[PDB]
Ligand binder design. Structure first.
Ligand SMILES: COc1ccc(C2=CCNCC2)cc1
Ligand SMILES: [Cl-]
Ligand SMILES: [Cl-]
Ligand SMILES: [Cl-]
Length: 163
């Protein structure tokens, strides 16, 4: 584990991460997809061999020795708020299991279901809180990746609030 496990946030492409493994914001069919998923496909295409996995699950595939954790958050266009909420919480629990299993000291993680799977709603706080609930019991350095200037500020505030 990390000597003093931390949370950090950076505003940049997760494909350029400086961590021991990456979480993909995957689709259930292991398709190239859009957003983080598309960047992950361009950087680690080998990781998409048999990556298909059901909603609320995570499946790790190695690109070389570099672990890609395909986490499938729900598309809130398809789920009810209640059921989507359950599946989003579950995807993050499965990420925490996989990060523990791999024995990595760091992980790069996007906010699941905050892009084209958000159903046109701001789910920053909902997604980040499910991330904290899953990852708080792990000793991995967590680095959250985002693209929006205002989201970087709000994620940074939420991290600092608890320190
Ligand atoms: C209209 O509902 C939404 C949908 C998406 C967003 C985001 C803004 C910045 N990038 C992350 C996702 C915010 C509100
Ligand atoms: Cl970038
Ligand atoms: Cl998304
Ligand atoms: Cl963002």
């Amino acid at each position: 584990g990390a000597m003093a496990p931390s949370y950090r946030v950076k505003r940049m492409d997760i494909a350029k991460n400086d961590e021991e493994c990456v979480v993909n914001a995957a689709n259930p069919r292991g398709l190239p997809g859009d957003g983080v998923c598309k960047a992950v496909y361009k950087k680690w295409p080998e990781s998409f061999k048999n990556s298909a996995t059901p909603v609320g699950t995570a499946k790790t595939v190695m690109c070389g020795t570099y672990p890609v954790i395909h986490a499938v958050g729900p598309n809130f266009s398809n789920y009810t708020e209640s059921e989507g909420d359950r599946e989003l919480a579950a995807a993050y629990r499965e990420v925490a299991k996989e990060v523990t299993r791999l024995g990595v000291n760091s992980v790069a993680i996007p906010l699941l279901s905050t892009g084209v799977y958000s159903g046109g709603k701001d789910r920053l706080t909902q997604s980040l809180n499910h991330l904290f609930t899953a990852m708080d019991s792990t000793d991995a350095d967590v680095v959250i990746y985002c693209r929006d200037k205002e989201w970087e500020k709000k994620i940074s505030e939420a991290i600092q609030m608890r320190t």
